[PDB]
Amino acid sequence: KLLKEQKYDRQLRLWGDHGQEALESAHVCLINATATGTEILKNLVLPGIGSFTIIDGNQVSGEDAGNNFFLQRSSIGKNRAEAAMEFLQELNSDVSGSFVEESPENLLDNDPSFFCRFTVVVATQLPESTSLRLADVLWNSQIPLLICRTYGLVGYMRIIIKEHPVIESHPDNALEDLRLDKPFPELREHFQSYDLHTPWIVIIAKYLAQWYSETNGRIPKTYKEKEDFRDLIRQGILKPEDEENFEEAIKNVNTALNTTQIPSSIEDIFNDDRCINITKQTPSFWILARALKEFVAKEGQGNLPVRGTIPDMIADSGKYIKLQNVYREKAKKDAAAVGNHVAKLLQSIGQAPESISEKELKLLCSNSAFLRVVRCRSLAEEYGLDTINKDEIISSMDNPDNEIVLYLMLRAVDRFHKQQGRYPGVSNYQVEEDIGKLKSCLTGFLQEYGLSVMVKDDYVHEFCRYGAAEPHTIAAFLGGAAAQEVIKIITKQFVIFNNTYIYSGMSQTSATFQL
């Protein structure tokens, strides 16, 4: 019971109890028990992931035991999946391991539906071929897939989720929703109810009414007006050759003034067909989206619900808790209005008014300006001759050393593997010979999709040098990065990257592309 609350503490302060809740209900599937997979599963098992299943068919080898922290010398020859599950299993007695002694290729042919049982599927070290299939099957049954790959010092991550709508995106920063420019009734009161330290909000409020008067209601706009609006404040410091909160107001002028308007990204949601056309099929995110859109046109008077929170301020106690409660109370109202629309909407559609809970509705409004929707292009689209995003690749390459070279190299290497039956440079005696064949494959690739791009010949050498090795530290990296991308997916709590993430251990740099 409470014993968990103690070990899972340092993370509960990141995704809360509701987050932990999901995490413990999820069930993850890892395709290859390599170091990459192994590590990724290590960062999910430790935080408390519900249960996991490893599907590996290969036998543990010498290299396997050597770079994997979850396979010992003693398991060489044995089923890599099974072997790694026993070690991983130890990291946390609350995680339910499982395994399948078959390969991904075998399952995709005999029980493609098997993956429907998983919340997310993580594949590692898969050959081009197998991916295109896995990505297909899963794309159809709508199972989030995450393809990870370690190659020499190159880490690769490709996320594939048709749609990932998020409410609690946890933004690291954002303008406060103060509403000085479009002040609501209650607020309008709590201001005129003064004169006879006072939150700088009020300070700016009053000296605003004054400027508003001697300008025919004209809110400071210019970087001049704002600048003069500032002196019009210093000039009221009573006798005090000290009055802190008054300077702690002039500073907010930079912000506080215009702090109201609908986020550009929220518009598009409102504009998305999924929001415009509701059907019993429509998931609750979009239902809530519409409810939110209705509020805007109606009791919202053009804007989203009031966030209902304010920044800390140098001020009197009972004076702060009073102002705090204004918003805290306005927000609670709006939430109710947006809750009305929801049930009317749920009715028009024909679902039970109590389909959407209040906890949600409470969270939705608190995060109305932070909603995010991510859509991934299917793997098939990226690989297609007519759907390839050439503009992204060509544009990126303007810099001969943009991480995307590694993407292309990875494509040449798969082309090489399809054609040669083996990866370039695995044995030292092949490195010299293979450089030529890899260069040719690189060109065979580029021509096929028709991409005029210059690839420093130095990258062809390096990839052969790599010998397709899976150096642990590179794998550990991915392990950490992807593990969190999985958790974001499971808790639907942060914002996942969009398409392809490429990390370069050589230069210790990384970038994100949409392919």
Partner: protein
Amino acid sequence: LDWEGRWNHVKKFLERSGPFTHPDFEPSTESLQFLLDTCKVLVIGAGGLGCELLKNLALSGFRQIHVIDMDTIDVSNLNRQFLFRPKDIGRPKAEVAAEFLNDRVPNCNVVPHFNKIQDFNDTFYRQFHIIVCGLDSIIARRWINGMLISLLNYEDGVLDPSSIVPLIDGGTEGFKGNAQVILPGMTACIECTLELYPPQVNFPMATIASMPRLPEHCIEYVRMLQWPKEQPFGEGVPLDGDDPEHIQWIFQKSLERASQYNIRGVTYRLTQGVVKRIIPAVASTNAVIAAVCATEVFKIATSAYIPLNNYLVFNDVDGLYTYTFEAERKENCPACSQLPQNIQFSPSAKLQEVLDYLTNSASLQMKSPAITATLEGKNRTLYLQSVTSIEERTRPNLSKTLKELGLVDGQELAVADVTTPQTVLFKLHFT
């Protein structure tokens, strides 16, 4: 010995030439064995990054590794420090960690050191080839930075390269992390970039027990004032953050204080967080930084590639983002500076206005310095601050002046602090 194929995932980089190879590189089939035998590496800290680093180093071909950590295993550790089980709670991290590691990885020679990094002196650090951090306080990062610098040997003006001990540093904090690579007296040190740190949210004493408007204020009080004013567990007994009872008593006396000013938001977790200055932590971010850092340790010891020029910052929150750059090494730097610091100062000014210059200037920020000079052909302690006894014996001189104490410009100024093991030198300039 090593079983067939154990290190192929490494041999590729040591036995093969490459374009992106460091210039001093030499492809050889004996490199790996050499690395394995002789390369001594010290890992400072064994929790979060520490655990992750030891694993990474071990599987990358390192064998001779030492780990310093003065900590005891705790329950909260377990969510991201995979080398500890619950059975191991109470024991010393450093011990349990070498234990696990030495066991999981066949012939590792991880040597634990159960103690503060301050119990050792140059003699001890001079013996390692690369040192890796994974500390959780700025002061330690500061301290070990000077230590590594003090080891620098200048062959009359020119620096002797064979006395430079590479220092890789990691830092984690939620879904954010960073790593730096330091080459004492060549690259920016921890001091050189001491400003990239955030400001410390210091609750203004006023509001704490007068204008409380936040649940934290209604805890910072019940800890910084009410506890001292009512020893709950016998007079003189300190507030033990890790003690589930003092937290309960503080949480309880917090609800009351909160209730007094009607500030909702007080909770046990929040109370635990305030009383212990907790930093939310996940295993994921630590796996990332520790991974980057290890790859550098590998690079720095092998010359397989060019080591990260300076800095890497990472953020997991919205997608994945990293930024790498080359932090500049300040030529004025109190630490790095192969020479003293020129201080502009009219011999009229008092002491306090030169003490606080060290205590408050954001470029040199020390917690409690103690200056000293050579006056009548003998070193007299103008002002020291450590042992209460001497501060009062020197506190008066904090009103004197530069012409007052015998300070004629041109003379150095030895300044010592907890922050760094060395003695920082300056040069008086009268203006």
